[PDB]
């Protein structure tokens, strides 16, 4: 079609050609359980991951492919990656720590007093004495802990996969603006404030995936079974830089003690933006939201 119309309200549906790139993703925490001189990315029998990038890699050597890296790497762990872009030149490395995301930071001294004077601005025969006595002692802990910690810096390493759902959502806010900002080759061919197509690891091309088109130009992986209908961070595809719906999560993110990238940024930003007052179902934003394509062989790790 040309649109398709959400709460009542209408949206159009937004190109996303080929030249618009594949990005994927691997935050590594112990490297040195790589070789080196071993591409640092998992090629592993059930998780042949480092082979799943490049066989989507040769189905599209024409649209560029990013890989969103990020770890303690060596210097012969960099040139694994380096041999890997020279050997194939549509793929293109990308280390977080090249990239800058100042302008979406927050400090949680910040955040956490926020809430609190928010709390005991409160009737106190209203308010939650309970979470209000936990941003405190969350408050009591950073202090201690350090002043100067942020949001950014607490989804870390350490932090398990929200090290790397956290980052991601940042990633695709700068969009394909960022191959030009950590200064990656042959890139010119990216429009600017323009899209990417985040993929988990293990969702298979098969097949090309040609121009897509989605509501408002945003979509993401939904899963299906046996009839439990969630959104996954699995799949999320944008048509420019700072796209709404996830500028919105990033404020709930900042809005929010205790935000979570997949409850908070990614769920509730989408959904709040396309359905600020929850008047279609959960599932009826499930598909509205629902990226489909054929040529994928979604989520593949499940097996
Ligand atoms: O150590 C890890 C593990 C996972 N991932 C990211 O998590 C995505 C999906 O993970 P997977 O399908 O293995 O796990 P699931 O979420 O499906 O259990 C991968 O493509 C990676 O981008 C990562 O960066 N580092
Ligand atoms: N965004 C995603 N596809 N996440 C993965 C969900 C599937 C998961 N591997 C399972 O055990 O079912």
Redesign the pocket.
Known sequence: SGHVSFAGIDYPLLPLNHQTPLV??????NPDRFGQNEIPI?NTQK?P?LNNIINAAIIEKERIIGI?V?GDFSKGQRKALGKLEQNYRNIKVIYNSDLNYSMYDKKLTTIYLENITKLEAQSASERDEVLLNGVKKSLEDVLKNNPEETLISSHNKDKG?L???FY?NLFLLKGSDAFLEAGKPGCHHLQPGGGCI??????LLTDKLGTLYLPDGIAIHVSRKDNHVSL???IIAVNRSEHPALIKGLEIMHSKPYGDPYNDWLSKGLRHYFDGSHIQDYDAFCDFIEFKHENIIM????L
């Open positions: 994927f993703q691997w935050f590594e925490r998992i998780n991951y969103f990020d996969h090290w790397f759902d991601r985040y993929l988990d690891a293990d969702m996954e961070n699995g989520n593949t790790s499940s």
